[PDB]
Design a protein around this ligand. Structure first.
Ligand SMILES: Cc1cc2c3c(c1C)C(C)(C)C[C@@H](O)N3c1c(nc(O)[nH]c1=O)N2C[C@H](O)[C@H](O)[C@H](O)COP(=O)(O)O
Ligand SMILES: Cc1cc2c3c(c1C)C(C)(C)C[C@@H](O)N3c1c(nc(O)[nH]c1=O)N2C[C@H](O)[C@H](O)[C@H](O)COP(=O)(O)O
Ligand SMILES: [K+]
Ligand SMILES: [K+]
Ligand SMILES: [K+]
Ligand SMILES: [K+]
Ligand SMILES: [Mn+2]
Ligand SMILES: [Mn+2]
Lengths: 500, 500
């Protein structure tokens, strides 16, 4: 099935009339990514580049925009739904509920199988050269060719008890090394730290590209510390994932992975990394810093291997649809587990996924007999002191009338119900997300502060209940009249389809 | 011409295929406004209600949505352009430049003519009853029938030197009185205050509905204290406006006004006023307060008179397209006159026109050798201590790459370049706009504070120049490549018209 095998997922996008196969030569130097960028800015069909200039020994084709948006509202999130076995018309609430469903289920550990498509071909350390592959230059000022934008890093705690799957960017350093981001509080960093404190060896590592779609979704979600993503994906899908052992180490990769790199993440070496055109929509030319260094010892791959690529930047791509929404999902759950009356959470695209809107059950709120200043503090302490809140700099509290999955309604509530200053609490003594330009390239500490809880609950929502009606068609006219107007609309001469 | 005569303006909307004439009976009790509300929420054609239940002695037809948006991007602002003799494809910059153009021109005083269409019919104090006219109930919880949503109040200083034209709401109180908002710092209030201090008589008043479109645009703009709107409209249009004297007082109304009320604004009496479904998108049921009271002594009107109506509320209507944009225009000019390097200003619809984005000439800024904290303070002191800043609670400073007329780009800049708290200055000791829910129905003083300058200029924009490129199709790919991609777009299989 498409959610459990990336090749099958590509076929599903075709069947959905959501793929464009480009069979003529395309340059991995900027051209593939430029096509992908336009797709993402216009919600077009995903591009599959089957003829990539420099493709050598079956490595590789590229699929862009794997988790980006479709043009119609009816199946807007269809590509995400296709990651998860959901109907293509699934709502974001349905997608995020699916991604949270495993959080109160027993893990279903993976099943080891003796082989799989990812072993169809191999290159040893004398046979590959990462500088000779058709690795894309994704943005014109990037500091390297970013091979790794939509694969899954696999690292395990020294004691063997936790195996983490996550997305973090990496670029080619030389024929057999990558550099990439390994930054706190991310789990690849937490595990790295464990190996560095033990001080004995580099971290055994694999990076698997074109993994089961349900696995790359969990890879992009801040599920709890110490939780093995494979078992969470198993529980979510109702099926044990099939994994094969790496050839050169004892980690386990999805059997149907398109491309697998095996090697080590250094506990001592660094190399130049970045800059990279990033999720908030910017690149700072020449802004290179030392990053984590990976050694690649072996490559295995499927016949006619396909590399997924996220051509991230301005709206809308995987960095918004997945990073933002999946953080929001975890935050929703985290608030509920802390006895806060939050029903829904989403990171508005309009905020460049730097805000999360929290919909409040105001009946519950009223029973708490609290105030804005107290509640704002409680909510921000829960979220901004937790890893799930890392990427999010503004929380917007809204009452039950607001659909947090509709950015227009979040912006309306924020703009009209939250008094600047008085209705907000700033948080300076929390971890900040340095990738946001106003952090890493801003006026203050790159790694600390710059966070805020903005209360767009109105005063009576804490006391006696909502005391307004919207000045809109829905709320300022009785039902019988509204329906009469709608029924007579085209007849009178005005203009009107859901699908389209 | 359409900009100088409301009847001609209605004909222009027809010719533009931007009118729906409804010739079957429509109830002024909510039905007309419900149709108007749906038009405004969907950017449909303006409705002209030619058969209004209760229309008596030629009073009246209704035109809704006179200054609202059209559906296509090419002539989005066509109805505003039709107020001003501009091409229907005029940009907002072009519209606001037209509205500012008279600010460095000599006024062209009005011309008195002996009669006009507004004298075709008359009703004395024994012949009309405002409770018997088809005055609309615009929102189901309004506290009265709001006759006055798009007419022009006309009041003159006691000394005769300043005659102000402005829009302020008013509702029917009884057979021969209205109540309405007369609030500081508005010019109707400033003039009222002058008459109250002189203490001798009620304020001679007229309210003219269906006035020259160029006059209702100026009516909605905070041009300076002491400036007679008629002369500013004269200068803007290049033509002296033709005015006729009122029958029962010595004020002068546009000759082609559809409907004219003549009477007095009391210096002593008040009456219940509101609530009203307002520009920020809300109504607070039962929230009635004492407002200004008007006595009507005489009504004159055109044959087949047409009452314009603004069915205001959630996006998008005249309260957003005119209040917000025309305040932004005046603010732009005010900043420039105070030697601040502002090139453009607009109130994003997404902010419910409570923000104004100020585009900065950063070459000029760099020459000033200043800082964010200093510049933010200077800009907020200029704007928030002036009447032009009254309605605006958040100013967003952006560099030259941002098109402030594009809300998506303002939201991107705000969300990614302004660090909450550190990059902002709050203003508590300025006049606030009580209509905003978080003010009048909020946690703090209804009339004071709640304002903020948010600096979305990046640090190097003050020093050495922009130091990023956007991670977008426009900026992260060379020209030759971009054009190749666009030229091959449909050929490869992707999808694409300006008008649609
Ligand atoms: C979907 C997606 C997620 C991420 C990234 C991208 C995509 C497409 C890149 C295009 C590669 C851009 C890059 O900046 N990137 C990225 C990243 N996290 C980082 O630490 N480092 C990164 O370079 N995340 C987010 C992380 O995947 C999540 O925060 C996840 O929660 C981490 O897993 P874990 O540590 O919770 O197990
Ligand atoms: C276009 C437009 C403007 C306004 C209004 C409306 C429309 C459609 C209503 C639908 C009637 C809603 C109402 O709240 N309203 C309104 C109002 N100003 C008020 O003091 N009182 C009001 O009730 N303005 C704004 C003012 O017209 C401007 O602020 C103008 O600047 C004033 O002129 P002046 O005092 O500068 O001469
Ligand atoms: K993860
Ligand atoms: K609030
Ligand atoms: K005015
Ligand atoms: K800033
Ligand atoms: Mn993890
Ligand atoms: Mn004025």
């Amino acid at each position: 099935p498409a959610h459990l095998c990336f090749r099958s997922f590509v076929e599903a996008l075709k069947v959905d009339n959501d793929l464009v196969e480009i069979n003529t030569p395309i340059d991995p130097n900027l051209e593939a990514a430029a096509i992908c960028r336009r797709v993402c800015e216009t919600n077009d069909k995903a591009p599959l580049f089957n003829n990539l200039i420099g493709m050598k020994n079956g490595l590789f084709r590229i699929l862009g925009a794997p988790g980006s948006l479709r043009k119609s509202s009816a199946d807007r999130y269809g590509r995400l739904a296709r990651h998860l076995a959901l109907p293509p018309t699934a709502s974001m609430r349905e997608i995020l509920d699916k991604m949270l469903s495993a959080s109160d289920m027993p893990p279903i550990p993976p099943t080891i199988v003796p082989t799989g498509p990812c072993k169809e071909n191999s290159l040893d350390d004398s046979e590959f050269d990462l500088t000779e592959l058709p690795v894309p230059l994704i943005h014109k000022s990037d500091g390297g060719k970013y091979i790794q934008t939509y694969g899954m890093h696999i690292v395990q705690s020294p004691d063997g008890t936790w195996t983490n799957w996550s997305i973090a960017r990496a670029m080619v350093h030389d024929k057999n090394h990558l550099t990439g981001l390994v930054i706190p509080p991310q789990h690849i960093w937490q595990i790295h730290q464990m190996w560095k404190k033990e001080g004995r060896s580099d971290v055994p590592w694999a990076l698997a590209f074109g993994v089961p779609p349900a696995a790359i979704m969990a890879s992009s979600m801040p599920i709890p510390d110490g939780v093995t993503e494979a078992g969470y994906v198993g529980a979510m899908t109702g099926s044990s994932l099939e994994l094969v052992k790496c050839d050169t180490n004892d980690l386990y990769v999805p059997a149907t992975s398109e491309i697998v790199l095996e090697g080590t993440l250094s506990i001592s070496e660094t190399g130049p990394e970045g800059p990279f055109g990033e999720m908030h929509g910017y690149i700072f030319p020449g802004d290179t810093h030392l990053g984590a260094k990976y050694k690649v010892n072996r490559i295995t791959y499927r016949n006619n291997a396909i590399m997924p690529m996220s051509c991230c930047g301005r709206l809308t791509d995987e960095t918004h649809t997945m990073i933002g929404s999946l953080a929001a999902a975890e935050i929703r759950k985290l608030c509920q587990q802390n006895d806060l009356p939050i029903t829904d959470a989403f990171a508005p695209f309009e905020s460049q996924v730097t805000w999360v809107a929290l919909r409040v059950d105001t009946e519950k709120l009223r029973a708490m007999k609290t105030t804005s200043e107290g509640f704002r503090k409680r909510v921000g302490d829960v979220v901004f002191n937790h890893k799930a809140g890392y990427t999010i700099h503004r929380l917007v509290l809204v009452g039950d009338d607001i659909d947090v999955y509709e950015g227009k309604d979040v912006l309306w509530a924020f703009s009209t119900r939250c008094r600047p200053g008085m209705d907000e609490t700033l948080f300076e003594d929390v971890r900040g997300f340095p990738l946001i330009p106003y952090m890493g390239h801003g006026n203050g500490p790159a790694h600390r502060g710059g966070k805020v809880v903005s209360d767009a609950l109105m005063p009576t929502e804490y006391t006696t209940g909502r005391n307004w009606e919207a000045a809109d068609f829905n709320q300022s006219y009785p039902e019988d009249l509204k329906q009469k107007v709608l029924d007579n609309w085209t007849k009178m001469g005005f203009s009107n389809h859901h699908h389209h």
